[PDB]
């Protein structure tokens, strides 16, 4: 059988500080967060309060743990309840048309859960862009505290007739109901393939087999031999032991560091010892240079 022994853990992709972050940046200014050089981590998300929705666009959710990604930004923000609709490709809406806008080409997540259980207070620090004069460019944000100018009469940094501050706040009323509850919502930026593996899918390590003829892969090193315990002692940083022929000899088990030998299969030549076929049809077979088991 085959041994694929990728190292122990090899890191985990951290979207917990994105999903569990204590103070989310609000919807109107959303986090964009580099998760990289790790292993796809949907395994923290199994035991959880339960994200009020889970939508991740691009590919199958079991390709999350099977498919590596490139530029991984899990977008940490808080939105009002109905606004999960308003977070998607092609959305006409307040969130999309103004404060938090996502591309039509975005491959990744939109995920809701109620923060009324937490983010609610009276918290008016939470805010949104109620009006803006265009849609945000892909993954772009609009930070403007600038006056929203309704008429050709310049407001000049003070209020006046139809002089607006376009950003506005959500008053959170601790009696908030399902329509009025904030939803913290997160979005994973990623390009799928075409760039190096940052969310490298947990890569299956087949159970380590010992003292048996196996076809092994260790951290990308492939070979077929008899893996045994061995007393030869590596230097810590090293990977492969070798031999005079440059052929792979000893290896180090990544998940638990141990020095494994390697060896050829039985091989040798078959040899048919016979008296002349004139005497007998009986033959005695000699297997050359083997131990009598694999027969």
């Amino acid at each position, epitope marked *: 059988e085959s041994i694929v022994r990728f190292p122990n853990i090899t890191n985990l992709c951290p979207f917990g500080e994105v999903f569990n972050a204590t103070r989310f940046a609000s919807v109107y200014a959303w986090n964009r967060k580099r998760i990289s050089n790790c292993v796809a981590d949907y395994s923290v998300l199994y035991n959880s309060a*339960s994200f*009020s929705t889970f939508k991740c666009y691009g590919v*199958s959710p*079991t390709k999350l743990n099977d498919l590596c990604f490139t530029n991984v930004y899990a977008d940490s923000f808080v939105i009002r309840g109905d606004e999960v609709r308003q977070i*998607a*490709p092609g959305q006409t809406g307040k969130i999309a048309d103004y404060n938090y806008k996502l591309p039509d080409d975005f491959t990744g997540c939109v995920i809701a859960w109620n923060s009324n259980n937490l983010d609610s207070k009276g918290n008016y620090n939470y805010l949104y862009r109620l009006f803006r004069k265009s849609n945000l460019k892909p993954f772009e944000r609009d930070i403007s505290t600038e006056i929203y100018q309704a008429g050709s009469t310049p407001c000049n940094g003070v209020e006046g007739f139809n002089c607006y501050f376009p950003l506005q706040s959500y008053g959170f009323q601790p009696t908030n109901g*399902v329509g009025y509850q904030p939803y913290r919502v997160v979005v994973l930026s990623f390009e799928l393939l075409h760039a190096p593996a940052t969310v490298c899918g947990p890569k299956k390590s087949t159970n380590l087999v010992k003292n048996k003829c196996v076809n092994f892969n260790f951290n990308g090193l492939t070979g077929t031999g008899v893996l045994t315990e061995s007393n030869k002692k590596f230097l810590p940083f090293q990977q492969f032991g070798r031999d005079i022929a440059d052929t792979t000899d000893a290896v180090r088990d990544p998940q638990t560091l141990e020095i494994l030998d390697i060896t050829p299969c039985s091989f040798g030549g078959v040899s048919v010892i016979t008296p002349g076929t004139n005497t007998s049809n009986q033959v005695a077979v000699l297997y050359q240079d083997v131990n009598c088991t694999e027969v």
Partner: antibody
Amino acid sequence: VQLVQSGAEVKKPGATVKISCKVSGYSFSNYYIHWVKQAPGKSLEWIGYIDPFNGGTSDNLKFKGAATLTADTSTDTAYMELSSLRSEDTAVYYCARSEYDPYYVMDYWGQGTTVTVSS
Amino acid sequence: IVLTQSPFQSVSPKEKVTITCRASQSISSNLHWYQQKPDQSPKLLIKYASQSISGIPSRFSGSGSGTDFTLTINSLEAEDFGIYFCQQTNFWPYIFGQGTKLEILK
């Protein structure tokens, strides 16, 4: 008003079943489709919602068939591919018309699709 | 975020029955009631936990209080009873009631 499903699918466990939910009688693009499983003599179980305009296939995690909901907008037909079949997946698979809105109602459904997953 | 129903209720014609949908921890003021006839697609009785889709008997009502959502039938008919379901929405996995088979005696 009309949701018509592909007939019963009998597979060996581990194989794949894909099931067609054919829309008629309404606008496909204006409604998500819920996909509802009833294990025989057991309760209603919702495998996911799909979007007509998009690949918005949410998946509940109660069981896992590597499922993906594909909707054919020309034929208005949402498919449910249920792979890695298990003898417990044996059930009547309903598809349910859902709002495209943030609200969730299934007023009208398919007729149900029994799948017998067994050796 | 999982909801609880009573597996069975047996009542008599004209008598009032109430079947509960009991969700764990938080609840959502929307809920959806379903009458499943044997071997037949469940049909939505109550939408938003307060309304009937059109054509559904006026004896079919719904509600909720605290974490419970009631399926309330007034003045049953022996044609009426069936397997009953409720629904959890906005929670991602849509947990539907375990189901309640209603019996009508007499």
